Amino acid sequence: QKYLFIDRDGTLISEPPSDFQVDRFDKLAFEPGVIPQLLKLQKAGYKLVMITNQDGLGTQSFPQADFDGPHNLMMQIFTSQGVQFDEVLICPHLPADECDCRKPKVKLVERYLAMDRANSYVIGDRATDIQLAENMGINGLRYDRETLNWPMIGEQLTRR
Amino acid sequence: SQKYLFIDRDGTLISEPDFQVDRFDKLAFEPGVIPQLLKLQKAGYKLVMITNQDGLGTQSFPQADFDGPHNLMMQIFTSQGVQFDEVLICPHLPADECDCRKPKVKLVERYLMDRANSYVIGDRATDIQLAENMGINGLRYDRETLNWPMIGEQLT
Ligand SMILES: [Mg+2]
Ligand SMILES: [Mg+2]
Ligand SMILES: [Mg+2]
Ligand SMILES: [Zn+2]
Ligand SMILES: [Zn+2]
């Protein structure tokens, strides 16, 4: 089974530069082409897993209720349009917590470590996403809106 | 002559709630609308949104309440490559007895187009009547029985 492990903020949707928290609906914005391109990847046989660090989620620094609105709407868009994430894996911890689950640590994905390592990828916009790939023994794709965007990824990962 | 699809908003592109999408938690996309509109654009159809928003811009439905969800809906469509030539809105109450409320044709007079291959797509009898008044085809959108995948297949 080929899997794509996909970061959320800065990858599926834009990342707010002030506080890195999508905690209001007016901060939710989809990255270009993510929907048709994930549908294309699924049609080529990829299954999808979301993985994300949501620093302080569920505490007063990032209330669960504030995260839920935009996140649940985002998920409603994906599901209604046919994009199905097998799991949504969330680390809610602060860096200072020194938790076992914060990417690029692999605790959240340990069950996958099971999959076709040659043809599975992490897709994310940060060096930590690329390090997650290395830690999982799979390939990493560094999402960039201009130079490695959703249409390019859709093409690259279906090349034969 | 250009092929057009005149598409209702509430109950057609997005779910219809008090019949007002005036909160973000009331916004929800209809199944398959994005990939199917993309398929339809590739088949050469141009898209025009047309919607009755009862009492929009009054105390009953402040413009600001409409704007948030609508603009987010537009962000999503646009970011995914779906483009509407125009978004045509009637903001009036039925009791206003205005000139622009579907199925009256005021909003679309400029189009009055390849009529044999143009459609109104909407979920209400009034959308179908709009089609009749415009002299083009009508498709009665129904999430269960005549939905986006079915429309995408039929028109391509
Ligand atoms: Mg990121
Ligand atoms: Mg961070
Ligand atoms: Mg309707
Ligand atoms: Zn953690
Ligand atoms: Zn009117």
Swiss-Prot record, chain B:
Protein name: Histidine biosynthesis bifunctional protein HisB
Annotated stretches, region: Histidinol-phosphatase: 1-156
UniProt-annotated binding residues for Mg(2+): 8, 10, 123
Binding site for Zn(2+): 90, 92, 98, 100
Localization annotation: Cytoplasm
Active site: 8, 10
Domain of life: Bacteria
Protein's organism: Escherichia coli O157:H7
Family designation: In the N-terminal section; belongs to the histidinol-phosphatase family. In the C-terminal section; belongs to the imidazoleglycerol-phosphate dehydratase family.
Parent-record interval covered: 2 to 163 of 355
